[PDB]
Design a protein around this ligand. Structure first.
Ligand SMILES: CC[C@H]1OC(=O)[C@H](C)C(=O)[C@H](C)[C@@H](O[C@@H]2O[C@H](C)C[C@H](N(C)C)[C@H]2O)[C@](C)(OC)C[C@@H](C)C(=O)[C@H](C)[C@H]2N(CCCCn3cnc(-c4cccnc4)c3)C(=O)O[C@]12C
Ligand SMILES: [Mg+2]
Ligand SMILES: [Mg+2]
Ligand SMILES: [Mg+2]
Ligand SMILES: [Mg+2]
Ligand SMILES: [Mg+2]
Ligand SMILES: [Mg+2]
Ligand SMILES: [Mg+2]
Ligand SMILES: [Mg+2]
Ligand SMILES: [Mg+2]
Ligand SMILES: [Mg+2]
Ligand SMILES: [Mg+2]
Ligand SMILES: [Mg+2]
Ligand SMILES: [Mg+2]
Ligand SMILES: [Mg+2]
Ligand SMILES: [Mg+2]
Ligand SMILES: [Mg+2]
Ligand SMILES: [Mg+2]
Ligand SMILES: [Mg+2]
Ligand SMILES: [Mg+2]
Ligand SMILES: [Mg+2]
Ligand SMILES: [Mg+2]
Ligand SMILES: [Mg+2]
Ligand SMILES: [Mg+2]
Ligand SMILES: [Mg+2]
Ligand SMILES: [Mg+2]
Ligand SMILES: [Mg+2]
Ligand SMILES: [Mg+2]
Ligand SMILES: [Mg+2]
Ligand SMILES: [Mg+2]
Ligand SMILES: [Mg+2]
Ligand SMILES: [Mg+2]
Ligand SMILES: [Mg+2]
Ligand SMILES: [Mg+2]
Ligand SMILES: [Mg+2]
Ligand SMILES: [Mg+2]
Ligand SMILES: [Mg+2]
Ligand SMILES: [Mg+2]
Ligand SMILES: [Mg+2]
Ligand SMILES: [Mg+2]
Ligand SMILES: [Mg+2]
Ligand SMILES: [Mg+2]
Ligand SMILES: [Mg+2]
Ligand SMILES: [Mg+2]
Ligand SMILES: [Mg+2]
Ligand SMILES: [Mg+2]
Ligand SMILES: [Mg+2]
Ligand SMILES: [Mg+2]
Ligand SMILES: [Mg+2]
Ligand SMILES: [Mg+2]
Ligand SMILES: [Mg+2]
Ligand SMILES: [Mg+2]
Ligand SMILES: [Mg+2]
Ligand SMILES: [Mg+2]
Ligand SMILES: [Mg+2]
Ligand SMILES: [Mg+2]
Ligand SMILES: [Mg+2]
Ligand SMILES: [Mg+2]
Ligand SMILES: [Mg+2]
Ligand SMILES: [Mg+2]
Ligand SMILES: [Mg+2]
Ligand SMILES: [Mg+2]
Ligand SMILES: [Mg+2]
Ligand SMILES: [Mg+2]
Ligand SMILES: [Mg+2]
Ligand SMILES: [Mg+2]
Ligand SMILES: [Mg+2]
Ligand SMILES: [Mg+2]
Ligand SMILES: [Mg+2]
Ligand SMILES: [Mg+2]
Ligand SMILES: [Mg+2]
Ligand SMILES: [Mg+2]
Ligand SMILES: [Mg+2]
Ligand SMILES: [Mg+2]
Ligand SMILES: [Mg+2]
Ligand SMILES: [Mg+2]
Ligand SMILES: [Mg+2]
Ligand SMILES: [Mg+2]
Ligand SMILES: [Mg+2]
Ligand SMILES: [Mg+2]
Ligand SMILES: [Mg+2]
Ligand SMILES: [Mg+2]
Ligand SMILES: [Mg+2]
Ligand SMILES: [Mg+2]
Ligand SMILES: [Mg+2]
Ligand SMILES: [Mg+2]
Ligand SMILES: [Mg+2]
Ligand SMILES: [Mg+2]
Ligand SMILES: [Mg+2]
Ligand SMILES: [Mg+2]
Ligand SMILES: [Mg+2]
Ligand SMILES: [Mg+2]
Ligand SMILES: [Mg+2]
Ligand SMILES: [Mg+2]
Ligand SMILES: [Mg+2]
Ligand SMILES: [Mg+2]
Ligand SMILES: [Mg+2]
Ligand SMILES: [Mg+2]
Ligand SMILES: [Mg+2]
Ligand SMILES: [Mg+2]
Ligand SMILES: [Mg+2]
Ligand SMILES: [Mg+2]
Ligand SMILES: [Mg+2]
Ligand SMILES: [Mg+2]
Ligand SMILES: [Mg+2]
Ligand SMILES: [Mg+2]
Ligand SMILES: [Mg+2]
Ligand SMILES: [Mg+2]
Ligand SMILES: [Mg+2]
Ligand SMILES: [Mg+2]
Ligand SMILES: [Mg+2]
Ligand SMILES: [Mg+2]
Ligand SMILES: [Mg+2]
Ligand SMILES: [Mg+2]
Ligand SMILES: [Mg+2]
Ligand SMILES: [Mg+2]
Ligand SMILES: [Mg+2]
Ligand SMILES: [Mg+2]
Ligand SMILES: [Mg+2]
Ligand SMILES: [Mg+2]
Ligand SMILES: [Mg+2]
Ligand SMILES: [Mg+2]
Ligand SMILES: [Mg+2]
Ligand SMILES: [Mg+2]
Ligand SMILES: [Mg+2]
Ligand SMILES: [Mg+2]
Ligand SMILES: [Mg+2]
Ligand SMILES: [Mg+2]
Ligand SMILES: [Mg+2]
Ligand SMILES: [Mg+2]
Ligand SMILES: [Mg+2]
Ligand SMILES: [Mg+2]
Ligand SMILES: [Mg+2]
Ligand SMILES: [Mg+2]
Ligand SMILES: [Mg+2]
Ligand SMILES: [Mg+2]
Ligand SMILES: [Mg+2]
Ligand SMILES: [Mg+2]
Ligand SMILES: [Mg+2]
Ligand SMILES: [Mg+2]
Ligand SMILES: [Mg+2]
Ligand SMILES: [Mg+2]
Ligand SMILES: [Mg+2]
Ligand SMILES: [Mg+2]
Ligand SMILES: [Mg+2]
Ligand SMILES: [Mg+2]
Ligand SMILES: [Mg+2]
Ligand SMILES: [Mg+2]
Ligand SMILES: [Mg+2]
Ligand SMILES: [Mg+2]
Ligand SMILES: [Mg+2]
Ligand SMILES: [Mg+2]
Ligand SMILES: [Mg+2]
Ligand SMILES: [Mg+2]
Ligand SMILES: [Mg+2]
Ligand SMILES: [Mg+2]
Ligand SMILES: [Mg+2]
Ligand SMILES: [Mg+2]
Ligand SMILES: [Mg+2]
Ligand SMILES: [Mg+2]
Ligand SMILES: [Mg+2]
Ligand SMILES: [Mg+2]
Ligand SMILES: [Mg+2]
Ligand SMILES: [Mg+2]
Ligand SMILES: [Mg+2]
Ligand SMILES: [Mg+2]
Ligand SMILES: [Mg+2]
Ligand SMILES: [Mg+2]
Ligand SMILES: [Mg+2]
Ligand SMILES: [Mg+2]
Ligand SMILES: [Mg+2]
Ligand SMILES: [Mg+2]
Ligand SMILES: [Mg+2]
Ligand SMILES: [Mg+2]
Ligand SMILES: [Mg+2]
Ligand SMILES: [Mg+2]
Ligand SMILES: [Mg+2]
Ligand SMILES: [Mg+2]
Ligand SMILES: [Mg+2]
Ligand SMILES: [Mg+2]
Ligand SMILES: [Mg+2]
Ligand SMILES: [Mg+2]
Ligand SMILES: [Mg+2]
Ligand SMILES: [Mg+2]
Ligand SMILES: [Mg+2]
Ligand SMILES: [Mg+2]
Ligand SMILES: [Mg+2]
Ligand SMILES: [Mg+2]
Ligand SMILES: [Mg+2]
Ligand SMILES: [Mg+2]
Ligand SMILES: [Mg+2]
Ligand SMILES: [Mg+2]
Ligand SMILES: [Mg+2]
Ligand SMILES: [Mg+2]
Ligand SMILES: [Mg+2]
Ligand SMILES: [Mg+2]
Ligand SMILES: [Mg+2]
Ligand SMILES: [Mg+2]
Ligand SMILES: [Mg+2]
Ligand SMILES: [Mg+2]
Ligand SMILES: [Mg+2]
Ligand SMILES: [Mg+2]
Ligand SMILES: [Mg+2]
Ligand SMILES: [Mg+2]
Ligand SMILES: [Mg+2]
Ligand SMILES: [Mg+2]
Ligand SMILES: [Mg+2]
Ligand SMILES: [Mg+2]
Ligand SMILES: [Mg+2]
Ligand SMILES: [Mg+2]
Ligand SMILES: [Mg+2]
Ligand SMILES: [Mg+2]
Ligand SMILES: [Mg+2]
Ligand SMILES: [Mg+2]
Ligand SMILES: [Mg+2]
Ligand SMILES: [Mg+2]
Ligand SMILES: [Mg+2]
Ligand SMILES: [Mg+2]
Ligand SMILES: [Mg+2]
Ligand SMILES: [Mg+2]
Ligand SMILES: [Mg+2]
Ligand SMILES: [Mg+2]
Ligand SMILES: [Mg+2]
Ligand SMILES: [Mg+2]
Ligand SMILES: [Mg+2]
Ligand SMILES: [Mg+2]
Ligand SMILES: [Mg+2]
Ligand SMILES: [Mg+2]
Ligand SMILES: [Mg+2]
Ligand SMILES: [Mg+2]
Ligand SMILES: [Mg+2]
Ligand SMILES: [Mg+2]
Ligand SMILES: [Mg+2]
Ligand SMILES: [Mg+2]
Ligand SMILES: [Mg+2]
Ligand SMILES: [Mg+2]
Ligand SMILES: [Mg+2]
Ligand SMILES: [Mg+2]
Ligand SMILES: [Mg+2]
Ligand SMILES: [Mg+2]
Ligand SMILES: [Mg+2]
Ligand SMILES: [Mg+2]
Ligand SMILES: [Mg+2]
Ligand SMILES: [Mg+2]
Ligand SMILES: [Mg+2]
Ligand SMILES: [Mg+2]
Ligand SMILES: [Mg+2]
Ligand SMILES: [Mg+2]
Lengths: 48, 275
RNA sequence: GAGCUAGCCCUGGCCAGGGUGAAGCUGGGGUGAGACCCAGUGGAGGCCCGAACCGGUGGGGGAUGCAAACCCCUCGGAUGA
RNA sequence: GAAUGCCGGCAUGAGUAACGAUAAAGAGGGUGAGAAUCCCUCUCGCCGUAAGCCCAAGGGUUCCUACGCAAUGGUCGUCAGCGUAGGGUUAGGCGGGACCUAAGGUGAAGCCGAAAGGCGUAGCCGAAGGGCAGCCGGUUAAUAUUCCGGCCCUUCCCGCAGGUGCGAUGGGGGGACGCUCUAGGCUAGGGGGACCGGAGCCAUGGACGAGCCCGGCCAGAAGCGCAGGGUGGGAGGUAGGCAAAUCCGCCUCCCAACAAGCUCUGCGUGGUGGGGAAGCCCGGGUGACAACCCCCCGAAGCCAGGGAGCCAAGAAAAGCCUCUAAGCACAACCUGCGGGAACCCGUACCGCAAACCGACACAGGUGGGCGGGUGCAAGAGCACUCAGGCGCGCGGGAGAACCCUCGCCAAGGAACUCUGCAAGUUGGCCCCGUAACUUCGGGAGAAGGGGUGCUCCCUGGGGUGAUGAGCCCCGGGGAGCCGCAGUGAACAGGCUCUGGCGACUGUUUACCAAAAACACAGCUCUCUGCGAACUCGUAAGAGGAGGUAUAGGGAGCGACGCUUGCCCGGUGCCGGAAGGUCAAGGGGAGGGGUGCAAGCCCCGAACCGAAGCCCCGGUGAACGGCGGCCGUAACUAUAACGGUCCUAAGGUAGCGAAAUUCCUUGUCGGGUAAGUUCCGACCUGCACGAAAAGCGUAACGACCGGAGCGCUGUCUCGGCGAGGGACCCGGUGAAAUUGAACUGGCCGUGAAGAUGCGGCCUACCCGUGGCAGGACGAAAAGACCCCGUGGAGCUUUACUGCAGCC
RNA sequence: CGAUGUCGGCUCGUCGCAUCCUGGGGCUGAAGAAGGUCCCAAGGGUUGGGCUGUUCGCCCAUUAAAGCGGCACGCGAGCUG
RNA sequence: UGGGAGAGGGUGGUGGAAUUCCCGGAGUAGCGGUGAAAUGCGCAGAUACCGGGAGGAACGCCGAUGGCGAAGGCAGCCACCUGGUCCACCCGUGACGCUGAGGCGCGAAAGCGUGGGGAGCAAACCGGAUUAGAUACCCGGGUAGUCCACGCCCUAAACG
RNA sequence: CCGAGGGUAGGGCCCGUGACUGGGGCGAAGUCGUAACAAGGUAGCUGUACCGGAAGGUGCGGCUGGAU
């Protein structure tokens, strides 16, 4: 049957992307925490 | 004269449609239409605030002339009578001798080919707009401004009329379509005669799908729900109300008056409505 | 977090083929005029049968599965909410 | 040493299940250390509205080549979507951007919010919608509308020529629209040809033939032709289109009107440029100077912004045209020609799948286009086949039980069983024919029947064309032939009678319930006078609705038919300007503290003082409720009648052992040989009853009862057969579970059901196929139940707050 | 209660005997045939259907007879639901 | 041809009286009701009186023993549209007549459907009385209905 | 070929019969009330509508076959 992951590059960038996160207090804290943890990538990869 | 159907389906047995007998032109005036943003009962938060709305036929909005004191003294000609899906009444296209074109809601008995006019000295003739203080007492009237220059507000549904009952200073007394007696300022504009399409109240939708075409989604009974949803929810099997009948939000729905007490227009409502 | 699922909004797309034969129109009859009758034309419908498509009724299989809901037979809708 | 402990290692189950669709394989020849598994050839089978082809998403080198086989691949492997390396994606015209707007998002102005932030007009962003200029062939190992060839085209810059009041983010026109049905002419596509081109073939009994087999096109500028769309001309006035306006709008006048004229598309032709089969020989080359023509069928595509009907009344904005304003009329714009200029990103490959979503090379999921031929009434259905693509990444044997999927069955025919569950039957088309009842539509495919192939003869009408031939499509009559059987294969209703429920088509518990549940048109009550009520929000602001009582919210009922009684004492709601109670506040009789005193300070009675509550009324399609005992008639029985107690009032009509009836399989009738079910009645209704509607109702139902016919492997009652497994051999090789085990029966005993204790009996050691009685067998720290001053959802006239409202 | 699956049916048996039938007996208010009642006896046998989930029961047609109980109301790692 | 009388019919308009309700005034201890009463209403200010307003239905005197129509039936007044009928003249047609099974149309009230309207009245219904009871007569309330439009129903002591 | 008739299926008319149910007629001396006949103690009858143990009552309209 239809499973739950249905990749969509535009959806991925627009929901979890860098500019989405920066527009929002909670989104910025996400960047602050993922940068403080030292993640090699701050938002999901998507090819545009 | 609503048209019936032979019972060749379960639903055509009861469906009735309007005769459309007065309509003379079947596509609207391109200079006077604009896109009607369908809301679906959602507000600017995206929240449903009016339940069971959505999914009706696409529509264009006809811009209507609810302030006819716009063009005092300038006669117009009734050019067409048209279908408007945004209202129950039909609409009338006026070609002003100006060359300007406008839509009014079409009163009962209006005829394509006649002239109409707006102003304090207009003939007491169907389709003419005057300030209320100049219409002779007794005349039935429609598209009535509630405050001067603010625009027609009252009696615009198909087949409705207000009657002029008397004067009192700057204010005339009206019998509204609801039967309430209210004072309205004499400088408020109004249009002689009742609204057309009186047979509108006699249309039998006939099937569920016709309600869907109108943008009306199915209404769910509170008694058919659960307690988390509604005061009437729950129960083993069916259940009477088991409390004073209530809305989804708790307030009582049989008789509880809801007009605000200290409202400033109370000084102008003479008799609350009938029946 | 609505890339699943629910509703709505905008913009596109899809619905083999066959059956039934509403209104109206015309002709004929009828009548004071009518209603109305008959034939023709007409092509209506949450109409009918049936693929795609959308469903998931009964039964069997599967049950450390091909599958954390599937498979076979059968069955519902299929111009419409 | 124990925590169903944690981490890791290794065992048991076991050489066990399994190796992923039952579309299917065999041989020869290669290669190589090694071959069922890689390569080639021949044979066989499977898909063919796909299991073929082309896009889009998503994936991201998986593409091509060489070199490999440790691991990955469910076996093998020389192979590979694997490892290493090298190569490979080419655009002014295709797609997106340098264009436009849609929902929505964002947001100078402005509004709001403790902060964060929330709104918000314009404007900006936003596409698979609008707009915009490329077609055919060739070429690579791998890209091609991109490279190359042929023929076309767009925009920008500059120049020349002719012309013109030129000029825009401003005005206007246009763009610009639904659903169903649909005309005319075309094209895509396809069928046929005794014509045109072709390497050949003559078999095995016949055929050297009007024989077989193969193919008979594609693109094309201007012009021309056909078929379509779009479009009135001139004048005078003018106050409207937020300045202007010669435009547009309105009025008058003349002329033109199924036309024509102008314009824009499609199709055809078109200079010219390409393509070109079987067969044969090593992807090539020949065929080949290949030919390239006629007839028919014919789109759902094109002309298109076509036509008609209908109600539910069917985006925007730019490009484009027109009008003018500042301006400028050495300019500028328009037309034609010439030269120049023309950027960024994508382009490999998979793409119904082994490359995407499902942990897997996973029987599942994934949007658009193309989808040939014949026959079956049609069709995308069905069978077989073209092009093309596959045989599903373990095999070889055997021919036990048992399982699955399938085929047949003597006699019987539902006797099976909770139930005809399941499986038979029936099955398309054409014709004859068709009942109660009905809302006159239907019920209806009712039911039940007859026909169905092939040959020959005669004949009616249509389409094309020409009226004729040919081709094609619809028929009618007559005489025959064969078989068990002519929709000869495949696809394709079993039917009737009668209840309950729900009117109906719809909807639902993704993944145990599809229903009688929800919804539904319709009915009623009620709120709402518009800055509406109501709803979301602290607000601003939205929705309601750019609506206005024939409208909008809420509630119940639930098509339709006939109906919907009595109770307002209690709760609710509605009305009541009196009265009663009532907070803050007002008032200040009179008290108290303190100071020598002026004063300062504190307590405070009467009385004035809202909503609410009390009180007085109303109100049932508001919450709700609608009795008991005793007596009575000239056979008996029963009580039309009466007495009395209580109530706010004592259940009306209709219905009733019911989806409701406890006693209960009530009683009687019906159906049956027999009927706890069913149907029809009766009525002492435990405990129906009138919009939580009462009683009916044609039609409808994958709903639930009862019956009958047809037919059956359901059964008496089983039998045989098929294939996939199970079994044996080679390859690979899990699992839950597991205190350890050297693990028998009886009768006892034991914490009360003993392989393990007693006593007897029985028993050589170890396996394989099987069966499930035991190991209180496995699985999940019982869901039932209780307990915990454990938790959560839910209710209310529990308590106490809060929103909201007054 | 860190789980002993719980009615009935079906299938498959097996055991007890307080025996339904068949074998052998005594008594009889046993003439005969037919019964009644008690004693011995468990070898074998103990039907098909309608109703109901039913066990049980009633009924139909037969029968030599249409037994009564146990085996976790025998038997769901055997099936049904 | 010329005339006449008439609530004959249909449509639209419109006038005064009266009842009810509402607003204002003024006013106070009862009103209403019956055989007698009670229910009811009234100091929350009724009844009785005055001014205003709304709304429905019916049409006093004229009015008669009258008139018109086929019957049912028709009553303020105005206009429009339309029927029948009677008289006078003796002008036209030349038996074109009578009746009338079927058919068709009309058809009081009540009743039915979908809308509207609703003052008064009033089935049902509630209450107060009466009574042995009183599911009645009498009284106080009261819903259909009475009224309008359209559509059915088609009955009657539809009688002379 | 036709053909008595037999069979299958589905209709129409009639007759008998059926739990139970509707009212009707009749029946020496039953129970309830008193609707009608006099103004029958509310004049009666009437079509219709609604209600009530029963006769009946009431509404709307009509008739005199109504009395004073
Ligand atoms: C069919 C397979 C399942 O077995 C049964 O379902 C079985 C018939 C039982 O019911 C089993 C016997 C139960 O035990 C009993 O529990 C009782 C409470 C007590 C009993 N004894 C103790 C007496 C005890 O034996 C229990 C609890 O199973 C629920 C066992 C318990 C260990 C389980 O939960 C167990 C893990 C089950 N489960 C959940 C099933 C969820 C629902 N589901 C069902 N089908 C699908 C499905 C269908 C199709 C496709 N995909 C999924 C999903 C599974 O995935 O596998 C199961 C074993
Ligand atoms: Mg899904
Ligand atoms: Mg998706
Ligand atoms: Mg995307
Ligand atoms: Mg997206
Ligand atoms: Mg976002
Ligand atoms: Mg983003
Ligand atoms: Mg912040
Ligand atoms: Mg910050
Ligand atoms: Mg990481
Ligand atoms: Mg780094
Ligand atoms: Mg992130
Ligand atoms: Mg109809
Ligand atoms: Mg009809
Ligand atoms: Mg109209
Ligand atoms: Mg526009
Ligand atoms: Mg909006
Ligand atoms: Mg918004
Ligand atoms: Mg709402
Ligand atoms: Mg909504
Ligand atoms: Mg309209
Ligand atoms: Mg409206
Ligand atoms: Mg006003
Ligand atoms: Mg309505
Ligand atoms: Mg609509
Ligand atoms: Mg509704
Ligand atoms: Mg509902
Ligand atoms: Mg409920
Ligand atoms: Mg519920
Ligand atoms: Mg919730
Ligand atoms: Mg609640
Ligand atoms: Mg409740
Ligand atoms: Mg409930
Ligand atoms: Mg209940
Ligand atoms: Mg419920
Ligand atoms: Mg209720
Ligand atoms: Mg209750
Ligand atoms: Mg409540
Ligand atoms: Mg409120
Ligand atoms: Mg009001
Ligand atoms: Mg999505
Ligand atoms: Mg379809
Ligand atoms: Mg027509
Ligand atoms: Mg349909
Ligand atoms: Mg059909
Ligand atoms: Mg299924
Ligand atoms: Mg599904
Ligand atoms: Mg089945
Ligand atoms: Mg399946
Ligand atoms: Mg199938
Ligand atoms: Mg089917
Ligand atoms: Mg169908
Ligand atoms: Mg279809
Ligand atoms: Mg639709
Ligand atoms: Mg220890
Ligand atoms: Mg463990
Ligand atoms: Mg632990
Ligand atoms: Mg561990
Ligand atoms: Mg571990
Ligand atoms: Mg470990
Ligand atoms: Mg380690
Ligand atoms: Mg290990
Ligand atoms: Mg091991
Ligand atoms: Mg081992
Ligand atoms: Mg084993
Ligand atoms: Mg296994
Ligand atoms: Mg497996
Ligand atoms: Mg298959
Ligand atoms: Mg196949
Ligand atoms: Mg081989
Ligand atoms: Mg090698
Ligand atoms: Mg190999
Ligand atoms: Mg090898
Ligand atoms: Mg193979
Ligand atoms: Mg090979
Ligand atoms: Mg094919
Ligand atoms: Mg995309
Ligand atoms: Mg991947
Ligand atoms: Mg390897
Ligand atoms: Mg290897
Ligand atoms: Mg290596
Ligand atoms: Mg491997
Ligand atoms: Mg694998
Ligand atoms: Mg490449
Ligand atoms: Mg190019
Ligand atoms: Mg640039
Ligand atoms: Mg902000
Ligand atoms: Mg954006
Ligand atoms: Mg954009
Ligand atoms: Mg675009
Ligand atoms: Mg382009
Ligand atoms: Mg081109
Ligand atoms: Mg020019
Ligand atoms: Mg347009
Ligand atoms: Mg438009
Ligand atoms: Mg569009
Ligand atoms: Mg439509
Ligand atoms: Mg072409
Ligand atoms: Mg063809
Ligand atoms: Mg002007
Ligand atoms: Mg050559
Ligand atoms: Mg299409
Ligand atoms: Mg088009
Ligand atoms: Mg068109
Ligand atoms: Mg816009
Ligand atoms: Mg200037
Ligand atoms: Mg100059
Ligand atoms: Mg650039
Ligand atoms: Mg490429
Ligand atoms: Mg697929
Ligand atoms: Mg693949
Ligand atoms: Mg595989
Ligand atoms: Mg797959
Ligand atoms: Mg072909
Ligand atoms: Mg066919
Ligand atoms: Mg295979
Ligand atoms: Mg396959
Ligand atoms: Mg395989
Ligand atoms: Mg073997
Ligand atoms: Mg198979
Ligand atoms: Mg055979
Ligand atoms: Mg047999
Ligand atoms: Mg049978
Ligand atoms: Mg038989
Ligand atoms: Mg049976
Ligand atoms: Mg049954
Ligand atoms: Mg069959
Ligand atoms: Mg068949
Ligand atoms: Mg057949
Ligand atoms: Mg019948
Ligand atoms: Mg019939
Ligand atoms: Mg029947
Ligand atoms: Mg019936
Ligand atoms: Mg009929
Ligand atoms: Mg048939
Ligand atoms: Mg038929
Ligand atoms: Mg043959
Ligand atoms: Mg069928
Ligand atoms: Mg239902
Ligand atoms: Mg239903
Ligand atoms: Mg019902
Ligand atoms: Mg019904
Ligand atoms: Mg449907
Ligand atoms: Mg479910
Ligand atoms: Mg569930
Ligand atoms: Mg689930
Ligand atoms: Mg299921
Ligand atoms: Mg269903
Ligand atoms: Mg539901
Ligand atoms: Mg429902
Ligand atoms: Mg329904
Ligand atoms: Mg209803
Ligand atoms: Mg209503
Ligand atoms: Mg709120
Ligand atoms: Mg708005
Ligand atoms: Mg319904
Ligand atoms: Mg309901
Ligand atoms: Mg009926
Ligand atoms: Mg009450
Ligand atoms: Mg009360
Ligand atoms: Mg009350
Ligand atoms: Mg004070
Ligand atoms: Mg209660
Ligand atoms: Mg109560
Ligand atoms: Mg009643
Ligand atoms: Mg009963
Ligand atoms: Mg019974
Ligand atoms: Mg019943
Ligand atoms: Mg009951
Ligand atoms: Mg019972
Ligand atoms: Mg019972
Ligand atoms: Mg019985
Ligand atoms: Mg019987
Ligand atoms: Mg009884
Ligand atoms: Mg109930
Ligand atoms: Mg029914
Ligand atoms: Mg259904
Ligand atoms: Mg169903
Ligand atoms: Mg049966
Ligand atoms: Mg039978
Ligand atoms: Mg068998
Ligand atoms: Mg076999
Ligand atoms: Mg061996
Ligand atoms: Mg091995
Ligand atoms: Mg291996
Ligand atoms: Mg040990
Ligand atoms: Mg040991
Ligand atoms: Mg052992
Ligand atoms: Mg042993
Ligand atoms: Mg013990
Ligand atoms: Mg023991
Ligand atoms: Mg032992
Ligand atoms: Mg020992
Ligand atoms: Mg010991
Ligand atoms: Mg021992
Ligand atoms: Mg021992
Ligand atoms: Mg022994
Ligand atoms: Mg074994
Ligand atoms: Mg065992
Ligand atoms: Mg245990
Ligand atoms: Mg065991
Ligand atoms: Mg056990
Ligand atoms: Mg635990
Ligand atoms: Mg526990
Ligand atoms: Mg547990
Ligand atoms: Mg317990
Ligand atoms: Mg406690
Ligand atoms: Mg405690
Ligand atoms: Mg607790
Ligand atoms: Mg919970
Ligand atoms: Mg336990
Ligand atoms: Mg355990
Ligand atoms: Mg258990
Ligand atoms: Mg366990
Ligand atoms: Mg003897
Ligand atoms: Mg004897
Ligand atoms: Mg003895
Ligand atoms: Mg024995
Ligand atoms: Mg038992
Ligand atoms: Mg029993
Ligand atoms: Mg015997
Ligand atoms: Mg016997
Ligand atoms: Mg036993
Ligand atoms: Mg025992
Ligand atoms: Mg047990
Ligand atoms: Mg027991
Ligand atoms: Mg027990
Ligand atoms: Mg048991
Ligand atoms: Mg058992
Ligand atoms: Mg089981
Ligand atoms: Mg069991
Ligand atoms: Mg077990
Ligand atoms: Mg077992
Ligand atoms: Mg066991
Ligand atoms: Mg069950
Ligand atoms: Mg006073
Ligand atoms: Mg009124
Ligand atoms: Mg007369
Ligand atoms: Mg004469
Ligand atoms: Mg009448
Ligand atoms: Mg009384
Ligand atoms: Mg008395
Ligand atoms: Mg008379
Ligand atoms: Mg014979
Ligand atoms: Mg009397
Ligand atoms: Mg009398
Ligand atoms: Mg009398
Ligand atoms: Mg009465």
């Amino acid at each position: 049957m239809k499973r739950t992951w249905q990749p969509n590059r535009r959806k991925r960038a627009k929901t979890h992307g860098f500019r989405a996160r920066m527009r929002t207090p909670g989104g910025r804290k996400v960047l602050k925490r993922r940068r403080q943890k030292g993640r090699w990538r701050l938002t999901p990869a998507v090819r545009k | 004269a609503v048209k019936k159907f032979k019972p060749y389906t379960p639903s055509r047995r009861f469906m009735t449609v309007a005769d459309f007998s007065e309509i003379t032109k079947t596509e609207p005036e391109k200079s006077l239409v604009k896109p009607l943003k369908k809301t679906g009962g959602r507000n600017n938060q995206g929240r449903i605030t009016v339940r069971f709305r959505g999914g009706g036929h696409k529509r264009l909005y006809r811009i209507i002339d609810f302030k006819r004191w716009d063009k005092v003294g300038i006669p117009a000609k009734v050019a067409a009578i048209e279908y408007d899906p945004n209202r129950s009444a039909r609409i009338a296209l006026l070609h002003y001798v100006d060359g300007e074109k406008r839509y009014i809601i079409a009163p009962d008995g209006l005829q394509v080919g006649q002239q109409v006019v707006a102003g304090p000295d207009a003939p007491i003739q169907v389709g003419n707009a005057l300030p209320l203080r100049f219409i002779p007492v007794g005349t039935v009237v429609h598209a009535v401004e509630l405050e001067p220059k603010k625009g027609a507000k009252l009696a615009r549904a198909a087949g409705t009329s207000a009657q002029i009952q008397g004067r009192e200073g700057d204010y005339v007394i009206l019998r509204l379509p609801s039967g309430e007696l209210r004072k309205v300022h004499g400088e408020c504009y109004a249009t002689v005669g009742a609204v057309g399409n009186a047979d509108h109240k006699n249309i039998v939708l006939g099937k569920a799908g016709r309600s869907r075409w109108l943008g009306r989604r199915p209404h769910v009974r509170g008694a058919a729900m659960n307690p988390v949803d509604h005061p009437h929810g729950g129960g083993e099997g069916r259940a009477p109300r088991g409390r004073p009948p209530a809305s989804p939000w708790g307030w009582q729905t049989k008789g509880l008056k809801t007009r605000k007490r200290r409202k400033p227009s109370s000084r102008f409502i003479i008799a609350r409505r009938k029946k």
